[PDB]
Amino acid sequence: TAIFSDRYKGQRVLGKGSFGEVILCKDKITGQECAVKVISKRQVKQKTDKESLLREVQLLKQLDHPNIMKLYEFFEDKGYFYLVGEVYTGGELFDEIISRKRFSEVDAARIIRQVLSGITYMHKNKIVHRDLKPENLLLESKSKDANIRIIDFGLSTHFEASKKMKDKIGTAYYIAPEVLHGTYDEKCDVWSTGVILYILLSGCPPFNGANEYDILKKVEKGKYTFELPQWKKVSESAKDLIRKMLTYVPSMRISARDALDHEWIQTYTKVPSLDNAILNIRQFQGTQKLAQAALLYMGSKLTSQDETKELTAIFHKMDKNGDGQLDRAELIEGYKELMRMKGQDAMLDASAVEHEVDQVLDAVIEYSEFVTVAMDRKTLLSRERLERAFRMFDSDNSGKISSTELATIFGVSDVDSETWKSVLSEVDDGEVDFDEFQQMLLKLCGN
Numbered sequence: 104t105a106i107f108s109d110r111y112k113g114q115r116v117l118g119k120g121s122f123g124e125v126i127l128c129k130d131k132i133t134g135q136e137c138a139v140k141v142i143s144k145r146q147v148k149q150k151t152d153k154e155s156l157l158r159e160v161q162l163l164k165q166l167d168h169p170n171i172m173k174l175y176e177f178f179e180d181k182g183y184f185y186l187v188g189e190v191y192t193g194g195e196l197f198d199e200i201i202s203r204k205r206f207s208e209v210d211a212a213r214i215i216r217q218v219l220s221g222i223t224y225m226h227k228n229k230i231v232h233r234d235l236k237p238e239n240l241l242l243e244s245k246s247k248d249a250n251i252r253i254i255d256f257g258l259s260t261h262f263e264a265s266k267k268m269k270d271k272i273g274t275a276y277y278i279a280p281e282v283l284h285g286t287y288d289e290k291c292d293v294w295s296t297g298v299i300l301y302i303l304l305s306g307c308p309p310f311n312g313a314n315e316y317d318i319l320k321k322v323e324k325g326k327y328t329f330e331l332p333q334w335k336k337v338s339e340s341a342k343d344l345i346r347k348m349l350t351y352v353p354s355m356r357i358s359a360r361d362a363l364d365h366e367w368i369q370t371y372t373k374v375p376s377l378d379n380a381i382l383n384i385r386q387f388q389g390t391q392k393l394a395q396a397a398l399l400y401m402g403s404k405l406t407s408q409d410e411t412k413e414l415t416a417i418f419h420k421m422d423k424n425g426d427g428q429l430d431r432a433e434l435i436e437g438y439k440e441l442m443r444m445k446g447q448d449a450m451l452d453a454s455a456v457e458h459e460v461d462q463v464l465d466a467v468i469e470y471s472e473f474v475t476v477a478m479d480r481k482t483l484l485s486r487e488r489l490e491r492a493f494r495m496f497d498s499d500n501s502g503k504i505s506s507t508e509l510a511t512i513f514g515v516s517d518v519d520s521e522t523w524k525s526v527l528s529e530v531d532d533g534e535v536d537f538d539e540f541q542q543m544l545l546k547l548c549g550n
């Protein structure tokens with residue numbers, strides 16, 4: 104079997120996916136850039152056997168559609184699966200919609216026509232997504248209007264979904280009811296697209312709640328309404344397509360193919376701006392991103408504390424003199440031992456570790472000072488994301504967030520109401536600043 108590291112080298116971390124981290128890699132010969140999703144075998148269980156996974160991979164490598172991410176290669180070692188595909192720099196669909204000033208049904212129809220084209224094509228080839236959500240809709244290029252590429256098509260069938268809340272943020276809104284009860288088919292992707300279409304034209308999820316379970320209850324009942332002021336300026340054909348896409352019984356629900364032939368798609372692809380919808384998508388995107396940043400900040404604080412004591416124990420055993428000092432070569436041997444114990448970090452090969460240790464050695468010799476800098480390079484990346492997400496959420500630049508906004512944020516993060524309210528009283532008038540918010544998250548993860 105071919106080795107991944109011998110062909111590719113890690114350049115930069117693009118982001119965190121559903122089943123693992125996504126790394127920007129470069130071919131060592133041709134120089135071609137690629138986005139590699141690294142799935143850890145220990146953190147992700149396989150729903151299918153080895154031969155069923157290789158057959159789907161082989162089929163996915165031969166598929167080609169302008170609204171589907173291209174899977175180029177597939178590698179596997181003792182503890183990881185590497186899914187190598189094309190790179191896209193346009194960002195997530197909803198991040199582009201919150202930046203523009205005007206957004207109409209013509210833009211919404213042009214978006215959904217692309218999503219339905221990719222889905223129709225993948226359904227004809229017997230591939231189901233199941234976890235279709237705005238985060239999986241990436242724009243091919245950095246433009247106001249760009250080509251949409253759907254990511255992670257077919258992975259759900261072969262990999263078990265994470266139970267960790269940091270990986271489940273913004274999934275409950277889009278999941279089809281039949282997926283929750285076990286019996287589902289490709290029609291679950293039409294439902295998910297119907298939910299995204301509902302959010303594009305109103306900025307509010309059709310099935311909403313104060314927490315993950317309340318949302319899943321609404322989805323399971325399957326009842327929703329077009330009873331919000333913003334729906335008065337939307338066409339009846341757009342409402343008709345949503346009704347056909349959000350039909351409870353999958354056999355009665357419209358197909359992805361028939362959804363392209365619908366009057367709304369045919370009329371609006373061949374109109375007033377929805378201002379209320381843009382404001383609500385801005386608020387929605389800002390709320391989802393602060394909740395994720397909060398969960399990733401708490402996770403990074405626990406991860407750094409685990410690695411701080413582990414790396415201190417590794418350096419203490421290597422220190423023979425007991426003076427507390429080590430050589431540059433010894434620090435590398437200890438850092439390589441940390442990845443040898445917890446597994447390869449998504450730090451692909453030994454060359455990335457020597458440079459990562461050199462970057463710390465240049466900044467910071469006592470190994471106590473090296474431990475602080477080495478570990479702060481991981482925490483300050485998540486803390487900068489937290490402050491940036493807080494600043495973005497704080498759209499009126501008041502410097503604070505209300506108690507109602509905290510309840511909404513902690514609701515999306517799935518932190519019980521009595522737990523955060525108690526933690527606020529320990530640190531701190533119905534509102535908190537960034538430092539107070541950060542202090543609440545630290546107290547919510549044993550600090």
Ligand SMILES: NCCNc1cc(-c2ccnc(Nc3cccc(Cl)c3)n2)ccn1
Binds near residue numbers: 117138140
């Ligand atoms: N079908 C192969 C699945 N691999 C895959 C590829 C990508 C993937 C594909 C293209 N670009 C980027 N960059 C990126 C990553 C996170 C956030 C943002 Cl806004 C961009 N990731 C994301 C998730 N999974």
Ligand SMILES: [Ca+2]
Binds near residue numbers: 497
């Ligand atoms: Ca504010």
